[PDB]
Amino acid sequence: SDLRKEVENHYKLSLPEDFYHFWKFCEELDPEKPSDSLSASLGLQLVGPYDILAGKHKLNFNLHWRFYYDPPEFQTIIIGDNKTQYHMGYFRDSPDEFPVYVGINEAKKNCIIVPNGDNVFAAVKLFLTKKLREIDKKKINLLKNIDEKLTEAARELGYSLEQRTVKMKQRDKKVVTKTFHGAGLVVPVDKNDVGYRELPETDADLKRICKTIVEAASDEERLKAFAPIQEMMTFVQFANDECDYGMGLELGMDLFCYGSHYFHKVAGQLLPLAYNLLKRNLFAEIIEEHLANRSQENIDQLA
């Protein structure tokens, strides 16, 4: 329990039981280097809060293995090839609740968060099954052995292995908007529909607006191209005054997701405030620190 406290106090996030059970699974695979037990067969390595379990931390965990498009909800636990910057993370709607599922993102490809089961056994199972369906006879036998052991453990522990579980499908009903990442945003909406209001542009049209800002040819033209964004920020101010905090979280998230440093200032105006109004204060802290140092490479706080 002491080790658990260390892991969870460093991130100020509770970790679900599958996190700890999966460490033990990887310890059975390789007692000497559990974090690397899937490296040879799958190209995956356990990191993040697993670095603490591994003793590699013996310093801001808010930025540790936080890739360029990882929103504060997303906490990296597994990394793959740095050519695509494939990685898996727990996704939490609230810092005070357990992860709602495991998402994957390829940070050199896009900002999309792909849901991959609701626990890390599922996410690794799905990765393995895809790899098995692609490939080398020598690799297959090894993969099939890991698949058997992984599947047996999940069955003993009661963990679903589906990419989209019934639980995940129920969360879809509470998502108020997908955002650019596609993971979805969940905020309280009361019986009077207070809590969220939509943006006045479609996602497609918002991306066009962002494109014209990024491609502006001068400061003068960029200022003019920013007018639709400033207009939406005024709407967000009234939404905040009126307790529809989800609007500013959506606009700020989309601008973060678009990826341009030209949006860092307004994203820093939208997202900390939105998270603080939503009483998700840790996420306000993460996004502030990430916007201040949004690195594309060298995000390992222990290197």
> Which of 128, 113, 27, 107 is closest to 65 using CA atoms?
107
d(CA 209, CA 201): 9
Instruction: Tell how far CA 220 is from the center of its chain.
Output: 35
Q: Are 185 and 246 in contact (CB under 8 A)?
A: yes
Q: Enumerate the β-bridge partners of residue 103.
A: 89, 115
**With the CA atoms of 276, 277, 278 and 282 taken in that order, what torsion angle do they form, in degrees rounded to the nearest 10?**
0
Copy the structure tokens of residue 147: 């698949």
Q: Enumerate the β-bridge partners of residue 89.
A: 76, 103
Q: Are 74 and 113 in contact (CB under 8 A)?
A: yes
Strand pairing of 74-79 and 101-106?
unpaired
Q: Angle CA(149)–CA(23)–CA(127) in degrees, nearest 5?
A: 55
Q: Are 163 and 130 in contact (CB under 8 A)?
A: no
Residue-level length of the chain: 303
Residues 6+ apart with CB under 8 A from 270: 233, 236, 248, 249, 251, 252, 255
The structure was resolved to a resolution in Å of 1.6
d(CA 258, CA 263): 8
Instruction: Tell how far CA 113 is from the center of its chain.
Output: 7
d(CA 35, CA 48): 10
Determination technique for this PDB entry?
X-ray
CA max distance for the chain:
63
Q: Are 132 and 8 in contact (CB under 8 A)?
A: no
Q: From residue 179, how far is each of 113, 136, 144 by CA, in Å?
A: 10, 39, 37
Copy the structure tokens of residue 132: 């098995």
d(CA 50, CA 48): 5
Q: From residue 212, how far is each of 130, 209, 218, 228 by CA, in Å?
A: 38, 5, 11, 11
Amino acid at 253: M
Copy the structure tokens of residue 288: 């502030």
Other CB atoms within 10 A of residue 170 CB: 10
Copy the structure tokens of residue 193: 């529909």
Which sequence positions are flagged as catalytic?
Answer: 242
Instruction: Tell how far CA 207 is from the center of its chain.
Output: 21
Copy the structure tokens of residue 214: 């990024």
> Which of 125, 161, 160 is closest to 144 using CA atoms?
125
d(CA 133, CA 149): 18
SS3 letters for the chain?
A: CHHHHHHHHHHCCCCCHHHHHHHHHHHHHCCCCHHHCCHHHHCCEECCHHHHHCCCCCCCCCCCCCCCCCCCCEEEEEECCCCCCEEEEEECCCCCCCCCEEEEEECCCCCCCEECCCCHHHHHHHHHHHHHCCCCHHHHHHHHHHHHHHHHHHHHHCCCCCCCCHHHHHHHCCCCECCCCCCCECCCCCCCCCCCCCCCCCHHHHHHHHHHHHCCCCHHHHHHHCHHHHHHHHHHHHHHHCCCCHHHHHHHHHHHHHCCHHHHHHHHHHHHHHHHHCCCHHHHHHHHHHHHCCCCCCCCCCC
Q: Enumerate the β-bridge partners of residue 16.
A: none
